[PDB]
Structure formats: C-alpha cells, structure tokens
Symmetry: D2
Subunit: 335 residues, 4 copies
Amino acid sequence: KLKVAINGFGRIGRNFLRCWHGRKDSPLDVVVINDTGGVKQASHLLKYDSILGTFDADVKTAGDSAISVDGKVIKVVSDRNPVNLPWGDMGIDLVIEGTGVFVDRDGAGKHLQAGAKKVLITAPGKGDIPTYVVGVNEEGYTHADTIISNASCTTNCLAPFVKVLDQKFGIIKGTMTTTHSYTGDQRLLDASHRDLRRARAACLNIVPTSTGAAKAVALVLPNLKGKLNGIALRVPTPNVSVVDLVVQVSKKTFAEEVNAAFRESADNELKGILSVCDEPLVSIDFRCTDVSSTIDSSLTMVMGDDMVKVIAWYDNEWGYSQRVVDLADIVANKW
Amino acid sequence: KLKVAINGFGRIGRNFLRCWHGRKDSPLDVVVINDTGGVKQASHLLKYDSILGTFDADVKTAGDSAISVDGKVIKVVSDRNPVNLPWGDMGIDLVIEGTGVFVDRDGAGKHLQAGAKKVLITAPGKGDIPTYVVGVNEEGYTHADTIISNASCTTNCLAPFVKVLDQKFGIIKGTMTTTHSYTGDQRLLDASHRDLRRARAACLNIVPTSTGAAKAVALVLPNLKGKLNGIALRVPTPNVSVVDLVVQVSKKTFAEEVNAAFRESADNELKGILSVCDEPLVSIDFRCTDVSSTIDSSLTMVMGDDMVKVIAWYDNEWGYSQRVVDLADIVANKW
Amino acid sequence: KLKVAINGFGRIGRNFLRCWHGRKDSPLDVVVINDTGGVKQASHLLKYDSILGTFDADVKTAGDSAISVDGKVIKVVSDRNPVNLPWGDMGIDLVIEGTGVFVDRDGAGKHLQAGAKKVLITAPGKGDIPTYVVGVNEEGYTHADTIISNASCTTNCLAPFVKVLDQKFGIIKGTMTTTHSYTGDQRLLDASHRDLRRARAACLNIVPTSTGAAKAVALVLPNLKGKLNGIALRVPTPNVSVVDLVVQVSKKTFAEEVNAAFRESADNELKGILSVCDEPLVSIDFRCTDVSSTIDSSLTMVMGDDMVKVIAWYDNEWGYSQRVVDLADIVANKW
Amino acid sequence: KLKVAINGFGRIGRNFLRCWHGRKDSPLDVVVINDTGGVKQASHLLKYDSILGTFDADVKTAGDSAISVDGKVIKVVSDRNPVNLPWGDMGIDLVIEGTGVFVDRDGAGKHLQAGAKKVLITAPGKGDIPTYVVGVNEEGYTHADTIISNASCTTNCLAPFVKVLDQKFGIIKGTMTTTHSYTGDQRLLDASHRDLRRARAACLNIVPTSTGAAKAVALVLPNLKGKLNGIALRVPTPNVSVVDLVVQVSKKTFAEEVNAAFRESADNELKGILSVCDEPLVSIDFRCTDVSSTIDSSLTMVMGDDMVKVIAWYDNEWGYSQRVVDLADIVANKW
C-alpha cells in the first residue's frame, strides 16, 4: 500500500528489506533502493550475510538498475546527493534513511527536496527531531511529522523495560553498561579512527566506548532526564548484545517481584516487544528473535532493598530492523 | 632460600614458575613440581604459551624426572594422591596448591601428611581457611597458619579498590559485573557441563555465570558482609578481564574526586598493586601488567550524588600469579 | 519403520536426531537414546546449539527418562557399559554409535551383546570393519554386515570428487591439506593433550594436525591405495571446513574442463551429494547445506598440464550427519 | 647515517619504525614521518598495538609536529600530495613508501619530485620497477636504482625456500595456498568491497582471495616464470600466516632429504632469513620471529617420488618489516 523507498543499502537497509519481506500482510510496498554500490553487489549482499545467514528467497539482478526478490522487481537508483533522487516522480511517500550520515533536519531535510512526503531516520537525530520507540511512546506520532527517528537499537532495547521499572518502582538514579557486539565502524586491525579506543582491533579487544543510549532514553521517557548515564564495551561477538542496567528505585522491592513486573508487561502492553527468559541461555540463542529486549530473569538482582540490577539481551541488527518496520507500518497504517 | 614445591603444573602452576623466575632477588627457591602430565609435556608447555607468549629462557628436559630452566634443574615427581609425594624427604616448606581440586582443609590437609610445613592454595577455600589478598589484609598473616588461600583473581582485582572506596566514601550497598576473559573449564563446542550456560561454545558466546568474587570480598574486607553481589559474563577474549562495579556510598562525591582517591593510593599504600590509567587504552594493553587492578579513570562516573561506578582492568592470569609470588615471599620473608 | 537406537547424545548424536527429524517420509523411527548426561541436559542441548542454531521444534522432558520432540516421546537410558543396555528387550535393529570410543569390532561388538541387530559407527574403524560413503561405494553394502562405518566427514567430503577425478582424468599421485573448523577435543586454553599441537588455544591458533582422511579414502576407492597423503590445519572458525587437494592426473586437462566434470556428476550420479558453486561465497555460506562436498569452481586451477588443484567446502557437522541418515535409511530401505 | 623519511604511518610504517629502533648499530637515521593522521594519534598508535604489543620505549608528542622516542625527536609533516613534502629542504636520501597507493613509477615518482634521492616501496610495483628480496636476489641492487620494491611479505616468505627447492631439486611446476592472517582492507562486518569475497565478515570466515605471490616469485627467481600459481585463504587469526606449497621437482627425493636442504641453507646462505623448526609448534609461536620464513619440518611430505609439499610459517607484519630494514640498510651500507 504505502509507497516506500530505502535510502542506503548497507546492513541496516538490507536488514529492513528482508524484515519487511517476511511479514504477514505488509501494509508496505518497497519499490526503490538508492545505493551507490551497484546492482550486482546489492543483489549478492542481499542474498548472503554472515550474521542473518542466507536469505530464503530468489534474489537476483533484473537488468542493470533493478533486483528481483522472488519475481517482485525492486528498482535501484544511484545518486550520492539526495536532492536529486527521483522521489517526486516515483511518488515516494516514506523514505527509510539508513545511510547514517543525514541525521539532522538539514541533512535529512534534503529528502523532502527530492519530493518525498515523510522520512524515517534509523538513528538518533541532532535535536528538533522527534525520536520514537514502539512500546514506549509510539502513541505520540502525529501524521504532521515529516521527519521522525527510531533512536539507537540500544535505546530500543533499554527504553521498554526502563519504562516498566519507572512506571512500577520509580527510577531515582541509575547507570548502565552495554556489553555490545562489535560494530561496522570499528577497526579490524589497529588503524586510524577519531576514537583512539575504536581504532583498535575489534576481534581481539574489549573496547570501551561512549553510548548515546542513556541520555537518549530521556527523549522517549522524559521523566528520566539526567537520571541515567552509560558506557559501552564492544566485544568480539558479531551480533547479540546485552544491557547491564543498575538503578535505584523508590519502592522497596526484591529480585523476584521485579521479574514478575516484566512478565506482566511481556504478556500485555509489550507483547512482541519485551520478553522474559527463564532459561539458562547464552548470547547466541537470541539471534533472530523478534523482540526489542529479552530480560534474563535468572540474573535479576536486588541489593538491598532498592538497588535493582537487570540484564537484557538484544539482537542489535534484526530486533532493531523489526522495529523500523513496526514504525514504518504505523506511519502507513494511520495515513 | 625457602624450600618450595609446586603442586599442579597447568596454567596457574607454570604461570607461577615464570613469574617467580623473573624476580630481582627472590627469597624463594623452587625445587620440585608434581605433575602427572610428564616431563616432555611440562617442558614444552612451560616454554610455549598462547597467552603469555614464549618464555624467555632455555627450557628443556634434564633426564626423565626433571626440567632445566637455564641450567637450574627443577625436579618433577608424579603422584595423583598427595599423601604420597616425597615432601618430607625433600624437606619442602611451602606448597603452591594449583590443582584447583583440593580447596578444603580436608583435601589440602593431605599435603601436610606428605610432611609439608605450609600450603598456599591458589583458589578460595570452603570455610575455616583464611583467605589473603596482598594490599588488602596481608598484615594479618600469622606464621601459625599452615593452610592459606589467595582467593579468586577477580577478588584480587576487586578488593584493593573496594578497600579505597570503603575507606574513603563508605560503601553502603553495591553490585558488580565481571566482563571476563573465557576460562579453561568452559566448552570449545556445545557439550556436557554441570553449568548449562558453560556447556556452550566459548568463542561464540557472551556466557553469563556466577562469580564468587562479591561475597568473597567480604572475607578480606569484613566491613562489607552482605553488601555486594555479582555476576560474570565470559567473553571471547583469551585474557584480560574487566570489573564493572556500581556502589552507593555515604559521602556525596563526584567522578573526579573518586579517581583522585585511587591515585592517592596507587602512589602510596597500593603502589605496585593498584594503578590508575588516564589513557584511552583497550583490553589488550593490560596484557602482562604487574598490578592486581588498573582503574580506567576516563570511565569512572558518579550519578548523583552517591551512586559511583568504576571500571578496572585486570590480567586474569599474570597479575594473579604475581600476587601468588607476593604472598609466597611474605611467607618466606617473615619465617 | 526401522527400530533405531542412538548411542551417545553429544554433537554427532543430537545432530543425527535433528537431521532425521527433518526428513520427508523417514523409513526410520528413533525410539531410544543412551546418554549418561541426563534428561534435563539432553533436552536443553538438543533444543539449543551455537552452530546449528535453535532447533525448530517443541523439545522438552517427558518425565525423567524420556524427552518429547513435538509430542513424539523418545526414551532415554543411561549405562556407561554397552553390554547392559536393554536393546534386546526393546527390539532395537540399528544402533547409531556416536560415542567415538567404540571403533573396533571388539568395542562396537559390545552392542550386539545387548542384543542389537546392526551397528553403524560414525567414525573410521580399526581394520576388518567395512567403511562406506554414500555416493562412493554404497552399492557394496550387504545386509550380512552387522558392523559398518561411515568414515570421517573429511573423507565424506573428499571421496566423492576424488572419485570423479579418478574416474575421468586418473589420479597418479596427490596430496592434500584440510583447512578445518576447530573441533571438540582441542583446547580452549593451552593445556594437557596427547597431541602437543592440540594442547593449544583453539581460538587463537592455526593448529596443524594429522588427518586420517587421505589413507582413509583408499578404503572406499581402492584404486588409490598409497597415492594420497594429507595434513589438517584447525582454524578458529566453528564450523565449515575446506579441502585443498592437489593431484597429478594422467589425462592432460585444464581448469575449466575439470569443473565441467564435477557439474556432470553433480547433476547425475552425485546429485544431492556433490555440488559445484560458481559464486564468490565465503565459508559461512555453506552452513547448513545438505551436500557432502561443494566444489568452489572459481578456484580450480590446473598447472600444467597435469597438476590439478581443487578446493571444496564442507559443513563438518550437518553435511556428515545428513550422510549418516542417508546410510541408516539404506540399511532400513533394503531390509 | 642515511637520511631517512617514512611516508605513511599506518601499520607498515609504524612497524618499520619500531623495527629500525631495535637494531644493534643502525646505519639508518629516521628523521621524518609524513602522516595525515596527526601527532597525537601517531604517538598513541606507535606506543600501543594489539599485534606487536606495547612498544618498549618512551613514546610521546614533542610539540605539535614531532614525536619523541626516548628523547630522539622525530619530525612529523602532513601533506596528502607527495610532490609538496619538504624532502629536498630536509635533505632526505631514502623514502620508505608505505601508503600502499603509490606503487607505479608514476605515483612513486612523485617522491623524487619533492627532491628525494631514492624510494623504497613496501609493496609490489606495476612493471618497470625492480622488486628485491633479501636472501633471494639482493646481490643485484645497483645504486643507480632510484625506485625499488620489496614485494609482498608472502613473496618474502615463499621466495627464499622456493630458491632452495629450485636450486637443489629443480621445480618443474607447482601450486600453492596461503593460509593467511586476516588483513586491514577486509570487512569487519559484511559490507561494500570491490572483492565480493572480501566484503565479508573477516572474523567469521575462511575467505578465499587472489594472491600476487606466485607470479610475483618469478620476478625475483626468473627461472620460475609461469611455473607457479596460488590462492589465499584469509582466516580469523590476526597475525602469523602459513604457506602451503606443492611442487613437482625433477630430482627424485624424500621428505627427510628436502628438510636437510633447508637446514643446509638456514645455517649458511639464509642464516637469519630462513629457519627450520623441528618442534610441534602452533601459529602463535612464530609471533615476533625475525626470519622471513620458518619451515615446519615435521610437516614436509614427498609423494612419490617427485611431488614435494612444504609448510612454512611467516609473521606477516614483523618479519616483513625486518626485511624492509634489511633492504634499507643495504641501500645505506653501499652508498
């Protein structure tokens, strides 16, 4: 139904495509991809992937500016400068902005110059741009919004249960580490990088970095402004990340009661978004799970009586892309 | 000077040997090794190691029950049952117990049956056994002690700065995660293990596990009984681990003041035991450092005003072995 | 139809179970598992696996000596000594011997003492034991055979195309390296192992080892006795291995003609066993492929005019288990 | 003595610096580095490295355009376009060209425009450019040569023993695989790359690639023109690579006799360049070895009677840089 274009056909982009493609009765129709990489490359990389594994579809080139996915021809255009793209002419309604570069209203604003009606950025914006997280504040999406964000996938992991915690015990202050699967921009071998931590061999190192995720939460849960801070440690697992959140709450509680509250929500207001796992699983068991955030219930601790600790696993790539589609077809669904 | 025997010549054992061997004017003399592995294997494995790298010494077999290390002949005996070992006859004074199995007074007690004068266990004991951590409570070692422990190397990392924090701001309650290099007992591929978490491929997984380290701290810093809890996440780095400690203190403080307190101690009561790093380093930069614990100062945070967070790197193998020698030559030094 | 028992429920065993379970109209019925590990563990490990990924089935305990797989109850018994097992009473026809230990006629012979009618060993035997490879010599299986082998999965990879090469160009002599995914018996950290190469950290090392595979080929392709030798290099990829075979042939040929011969067979006598890949794929694209051996056609070289080189990818775990079922239901099919 | 400038201060460049710096009585003096990265970064990255480990030196910034290495101030300049660099004014004699980009006489020729007297490229050139390998053809270096190459470090590994083999048994034809530590230009995660093989996650994959090394050998051992071909398989080890060379020789030989010939040369014409290892070592034991190439003698095979197979380990980074200095101080030594 909704005329959809994907800007950028790297990990996030391709990820969105196969996510959308696996859906029951998608309100969305994807007609075009803007990628400078070329049609041969876009095809190949869409079909094969070390993390998501081979795509279960007939993916091939259809001429020299399109790919088919089981017959379904998708168009492929190739401009570096977004103001050019034949959006207008192709009557595009929603752009998935996955390049990572055009995060402001001034960079992303270039898409509505090509004559596109709405833009969804797959990354936090630099102010004045409304971020949204399905399960957290999705209710607040006006149709008037021309440019919207979906935040980091860490924030997509963290916000849902922070909501639950805040709603039910009342976060006073808290801090958080994100044990995080290594990520594209890091260095295979020690080499040049603006972050001297991130210049360093990704496969050999626990590498510390800043995370936007803590302050970023405040954007979608205003009640938490300046109550959280964080750090990330990139580790040599390719995918699947864990958040390690310590908060102090106002309602005296205990480990078991916390876990009950998450289950309460996992079966109700967050069904499909939050899960609670009561099994002794390891990181690679959360590969390809459809939820933003799974609480590892055996690991929840409360010291005592008000400092609560919570460990949640998230699939950094797939779980996030799932949300992007969840957001995109709310945009579509209420037109 | 001190007649020293090493029981068990696996990682911990060999590690102790090359640690001792690199020392200025060692009060210790190592004369015997009890290993069922054999002399060819003990030699080879002592010379070559993926983590510590090739040992800078002439290591070779000397006949069939001894190895030389640059001429210095060390004897090698081979009984499974410790009550047998010719300790008495060889006049052994101090046994480094590195097998991991004989942790109680009833298992380790078997060494003084062979006629050994004192035993040092390289692991926490099961009650009635005094643990000791150099920098923390080493002052309390009586000579009367026949069986002593050195705790986990995690506790050896954590106790020193927990001391500082407790002494200076006063820990009320706190919790802690140990991002930890994977460890020998874990599974290369998914296979049988008492811990279903630990049955799982070590090189592919963030694997959660219990850590003794938090309660274990209380043993050496009694003021902290039941104030700390913890968890570990084994990750696919071979060596070099980080502790991620969140506490609530009673003296309102700020990130910068905390770091000053560690530096205060790193230059004084903990010189050589605690360091503070002001450089943006990554895990593999702490390989082969001589200290129990290095604070990553850029990472210290305080929210607000009393919840303090501290990240410290430790070399799990080398730093710990360094302490074992530090303990062993206190035992020797005051005879 | 065929009454089937699985001895040993580690990687190979569990692998066979989920392989069998995914089949169109299996002639096989699996009724019992002999595993000392326990029912809780066998369930969990059957459901979750880092290499094959979560099993797409309802796997759970059914009482204390059985597991269900989507309702289908499988029995679980637990003796260490095979002569005991209630095979006779349970009327077992075919034992999948996956423990790895009972490879001779004298060790495996213990199963027919429990009153089992035929045994299939999932590893090369020590002489007098007929090995079989589907696609290579499966035609020669008499029903009289009480004990049969399926060789190494390396031999299962190598034999098929060695056949083709031998049949069509005529191998004179040749040599071969198996770049091989690391394997269970290797060491996570440097520690005790009969092979001093294999004592060493698996995740950090290219580790050289002996392979049975070259001489083992001669067993199923007698024409090649003493014409091949090999070595393996274990590498830090978990699964998916490559064979790097150099032969000298008698029929002067060229890279392109060789590849044509494999395709000839991949579409005919080896359809489902050998594939030829004309795509620039990497190791992790061959995960979960159903064939013994995929030729990487872009990589075939001929120097000149008679020294041919061939690179084939194989899934060490899954592809092999697929064959085990292929063998097991030939045994069943011709009763 | 020799006025030396280093162009490019990435892995190869920094590697050369610490290599030169560790030398007995270097005829070389390094006075300048051209790096766009900046002085803070160049310092840090020179001091810390995941592969070579912390540099054993006082490395720090000295003002804003220089670094000190134990007092010894080295200058740091920063132009992208080489024709600009103040070589002339600084009286530079020899440029180490380590950027990788300026490999032709037309790109590298730009350095002698800045007024530099000789250039040494750390990579194969595109024709008309003399390559040199110490131990192989170093005798042929005229002083007239303004632009020289040092080939790939694979060729630096392979050429020495190919020489020995050719000299002593006489290579007729042969083929070769290079199991190779992953390398900078590969992809941390599946992403855009001219080579679709090399676009793929480096840490998860055995990735096949073309190697220049086989044809490249012919350049330094002309007798072997069109007698060798090769392929590489990048694997997830960071450093330390192995060459797997199969040749057919004319002198009927046997495994043991081959190995004797290498030892013959390792103690004579190739002392310090080729070694022969008779120990069951693994890849990570060859870290930081000073030789181009170590033969793994236990692995040599001869089938039969004339197809010889040889496995040699090389340190891709350090061993090569060692040669670069070996070449540079021949240039210096005969002025």
